[PDB]
Design a protein around this ligand. Sequence first.
Ligand SMILES: Nc1ncnc2c1ncn2[C@@H]1O[C@H](COP(=O)(O)OP(=O)(O)O)[C@@H](O)[C@H]1O
Ligand SMILES: Nc1ncnc2c1ncn2[C@@H]1O[C@H](COP(=O)(O)OP(=O)(O)O)[C@@H](O)[C@H]1O
Ligand SMILES: [Mg+2]
Ligand SMILES: [Mg+2]
Lengths: 115, 115, 132, 132
Amino acid sequence: SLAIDLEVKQDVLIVRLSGELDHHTAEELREQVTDVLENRAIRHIVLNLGQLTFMDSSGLGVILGRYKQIKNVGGQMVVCAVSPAVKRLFDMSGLFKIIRVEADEQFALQALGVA
Amino acid sequence: SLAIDLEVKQDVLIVRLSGELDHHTAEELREQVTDVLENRAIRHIVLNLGQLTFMDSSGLGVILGRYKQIKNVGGQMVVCAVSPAVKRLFDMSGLFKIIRVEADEQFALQALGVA
Amino acid sequence: MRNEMHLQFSARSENESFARVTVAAFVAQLDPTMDELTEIKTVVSEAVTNAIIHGYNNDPNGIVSISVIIEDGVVHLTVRDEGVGIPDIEEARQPLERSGMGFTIMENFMDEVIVESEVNKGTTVYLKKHGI
Amino acid sequence: MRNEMHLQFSARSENESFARVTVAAFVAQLDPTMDELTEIKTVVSEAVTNAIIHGYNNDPNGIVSISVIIEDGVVHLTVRDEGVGIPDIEEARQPLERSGMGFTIMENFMDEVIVESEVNKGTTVYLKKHGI
Ligand SMILES: Nc1ncnc2c1ncn2[C@@H]1O[C@H](COP(=O)(O)OP(=O)(O)O)[C@@H](O)[C@H]1O
Ligand SMILES: Nc1ncnc2c1ncn2[C@@H]1O[C@H](COP(=O)(O)OP(=O)(O)O)[C@@H](O)[C@H]1O
Ligand SMILES: [Mg+2]
Ligand SMILES: [Mg+2]
């Protein structure tokens, strides 16, 4: 229900999600991501949501849990290729104010100077 | 849930089904087909099931109701492009013995001499 | 992990599809083949259609109830209604637009089929499928 | 034509998806837009997820119950559990991996949201969506 493809480019962790993100699938994501943040010098996180077909507040929670981590190292959280539905959750929750939204992974990486 | 495309070629009524055939959708089929049989000299019926994704015993009932009609005019009932699932219903019910099964509409029409 | 689901709905023909979809969605958690899923969907359709047209005589106020218990790869499917019932169960299982194939299909596709009924009480069909 | 459906299922996280699918399948009979369907699926997910993780504390023996009444183009969605309940409802509606957005999302996507709860009794969330 949720495929996770990770990749590191310098101090940026690229998280590519495919499928649906809810409380049921969020756990495997949290574990996988926090593992990377522990055994690597990551300052930023690019969340590629182009292949994500669904997300609820649990998706916002896992993102927000990471945001706190990234904020601790002075880095930035970037989400890209966001669906209108997911964009609706970011506006309504004000997350659009603390997390940058970009068109796609390339522009997101460019914004972080790693492309 | 069930699209019905009809066409007459000589004394043969071609019934092309798309979607699912159950008790809920069978009624519109019965009405449409019996209307054609009443205002036209139909002796045979070719049932094209290539685009049908589902069928239960109600589909067998509507077919069997027609078979009785066709048998009254000495004609033949032909079903084509049948899925393995539907083929399973024809074997199990013995309908394969009184109704001819063909690969596709063209061979079915050929078997009826109208192509 | 033993998972269970129970669904009740108005005795309307459009819900035949809804019932197929729902039970299939629930059985999917077991990763069954397309053929196994087709079989499950079909027997659900037979039983649910029987409840609607035979049990409640198409009266939308009737309530069709379904239960799906999944335990140890085994699927326990139960379809019931509180309709008019069946006088002689044995006779009814024997193969108007009626195909008379309903019970036979259920019996063939499933590994076990138990039918219980009582006039003016209702009917309950217990189906079991082994081997995911 | 007023159609109704009731679904009960084990308090398991994999059933979150199952609940979204089922309610959406039932609401589809009204031919809603993709956005309306997404909204319905999301609020169902919020409420059902709340019942599971908050109401039953992830205990799979708990039973989550849903009701969907469709009447005159209006969707009446009710999600309930017999879990631990909420001490102060008002406080809980206010925005650990918790986003605290659940109720806000339900309130925004739906046209009406009524929450009822009692400690050690359970919680019931009534949601209403107007205009198909
Ligand atoms: N839920 C039910 N309520 C009342 N009668 C039923 C029910 N299910 C089955 N029956 C009886 O059993 C008969 C056989 O059912 P089935 O094998 O599905 O064939 P069919 O529905 O084509 O008649 C029905 O015609 C009906 O008389
Ligand atoms: N069914 C429920 N059973 C018990 N507590 C609940 C239930 N639904 C909501 N709550 C309470 O309301 C709080 C707010 O829920 P919500 O807005 O969805 O945010 P979150 O789930 O992210 O905490 C929950 O943390 C919980 O304390
Ligand atoms: Mg039947
Ligand atoms: Mg929540």
